[PDB]
Design a protein around this ligand. Structure first.
Ligand SMILES: Cc1sc2c(c1C)C(c1ccc(Cl)cc1)=N[C@@H](CC(=O)OC(C)(C)C)c1[nH]nc(C)[n+]1-2
Ligand SMILES: Cc1sc2c(c1C)C(c1ccc(Cl)cc1)=N[C@@H](CC(=O)OC(C)(C)C)c1[nH]nc(C)[n+]1-2
Lengths: 107, 107
């Protein structure tokens, strides 16, 4: 789509390059990070690797569907972590860029 | 703005009319609802009344700034409540409509 291609080519590409993006490239590994409560607190895990793959496989029916996965990704981070945690502040920075780019999307 | 006017006239108006919107018309009243931990868990309270007022007062510098307040509103609800709670499912429904309408915004 003009809109889905834009989510892959502008939104994912911009965010992927950001210095704060690295924690979100792959799923939260609750085993490696020793987070036994992660999967009971977070019911819909999401990450940017998954989103990028979904865009490439034409998983989404609409740009809004993709936007939802980004929102989930960020929200999961705010649900699991304390409001002052580094990872929260990083997510907020990334979420702001996400929104700024979503607002400049074509109709 | 074309975009900010659209956030007031389409996004707020559509959501306000929705059957699930009523909990979000005004700030969470942690006293009336007996929620002593609400304000320590939720660092940025947000509601649609506040957003609507902000739009009318030209508080926002951009549509993305407004979008951020909506995201905060919904996220607060997911942070404070359990994933199976009625209020969470209501927020998810409203958030989906928010995103569907954001995707149909003018550039
Ligand atoms: C690869 C990934 S994914 C991730 C993190 C890392 C490292 C980090 C993290 C990332 C960056 C900085 Cl500066 C700090 C923490 N935190 C965890 C939660 C946690 O508590 O992990 C520690 C036990 C603290 C490791 C978390 N929640 N949500 C996400 C996306 N992450
Ligand atoms: C006016 C408002 S604002 C609100 C609620 C109500 C009623 C409801 C609520 C609204 C609708 C349904 Cl069907 C169920 C609950 N819940 C609280 C949290 C809570 O625990 O409140 C109870 C103690 C359960 C009252 C909450 N969190 N976030 C928000 C926006 N709210």
């Amino acid at each position: 789509t003009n809109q889905l291609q834009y989510m892959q080519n502008v939104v994912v590409k911009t965010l992927w390059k950001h210095q704060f993006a690295w924690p979100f490239y792959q799923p939260v590994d609750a085993i490696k990070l020793n987070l036994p409560d992660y999967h009971k607190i977070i019911k819909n895990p999401m990450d940017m690797g998954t989103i990028k793959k979904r865009l490439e496989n034409n998983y989404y029916w609409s740009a809004s569907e993709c936007m939802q996965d980004f929102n989930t990704m960020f929200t999961n981070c705010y649900i699991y972590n304390k409001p002052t945690d580094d990872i929260v502040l990083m997510a907020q920075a990334l979420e702001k860029i996400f929104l700024q780019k979503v607002a400049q999307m074509p109709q």
